């Protein structure tokens, strides 16, 4: 059922989006790295959803940012056609666990949670080839995430920062 509307505004990213490229300790040195980074002083399409074609292209990677506190946001969906003819992700978070499945989901036009049944996300999945369960990622505050994939490896970075009253 279509009940979501969306508007877009534009703003800048300033000096944000730097992550540790490798898990090796370094101190008092300047290191030159080459990888997928968010360039300085770039567009960031501030999306506002109120209650719609939210099939946003992925391209090389995605930097996601959220400043809300009510935790109305949860989980993500990934795919190439968002249909049952191709496999898709179902990264979904709640207050206790995160489940990650790769399967041929039949995604609806707009997916959501009734809150707590995901019947409106997909109709039925048949051939699943990957399942995973872990502790949920999400825990006046800004939450930043980086998603990318290289050589069949999906990598997710995150960070939590305190932000004062700034628009």
């Amino acid at each position, epitope marked *: 059922v279509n009940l979501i509307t969306r508007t877009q505004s*534009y703003t*800048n990213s300033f000096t944000r989006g730097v992550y540790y490229p490798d898990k090796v300790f370094r101190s008092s040195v300047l290191h030159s790295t080459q990888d997928l980074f968010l360039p300085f002083f770039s567009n960031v399409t501030w999306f506002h959803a109120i209650h719609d074609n939210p099939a946003l292209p992925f391209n090389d990677g995605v930097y996601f940012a959220s400043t809300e506190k009510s935790n109305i946001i949860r989980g993500w969906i990934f795919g190439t056609t968002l249909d049952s003819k191709t496999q898709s992700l179902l990264i979904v978070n709640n207050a206790t666990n995160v489940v990650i499945k790769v399967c041929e989901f039949q995604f609806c036009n707009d997916p959501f949670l009734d809150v707590e049944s995901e019947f409106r996300v997909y109709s039925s999945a048949n051939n699943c080839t990957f399942e995973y369960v872990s502790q949920p990622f999400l825990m006046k505050n800004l939450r930043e995430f980086v998603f990318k994939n290289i050589d069949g490896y999906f990598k997710i970075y995150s960070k939590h920062t305190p932000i004062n009253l700034e628009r």
Partner: nanobody
Amino acid sequence: QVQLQESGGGLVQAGGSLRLSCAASESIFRMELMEWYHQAPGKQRELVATINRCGSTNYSDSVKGRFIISSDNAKNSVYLQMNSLKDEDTAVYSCHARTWTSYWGRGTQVTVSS
């Protein structure tokens, strides 16, 4: 193609209102500063208003209370609001922007009759 293009000039009687607008082909985010200069026939250039990247805004002594300079992040441009014009406001205006070198524009000959 030229980067900074200006518009909003013409003849306007005293006490009216007008809108000056200069648009840049490059994104207005990296320009790091945008200023409006004006000069009158036979006089030297003086700064009217300036806005930096962060959001700090500054004006001149004879500019406060009548002029407002602001930019929107939809079409990359900077707008100046001409309010409570007098005879001495008649001049030629040009906007300036410096990322790592200065870029200038021309035009916008505004005249006030009294």
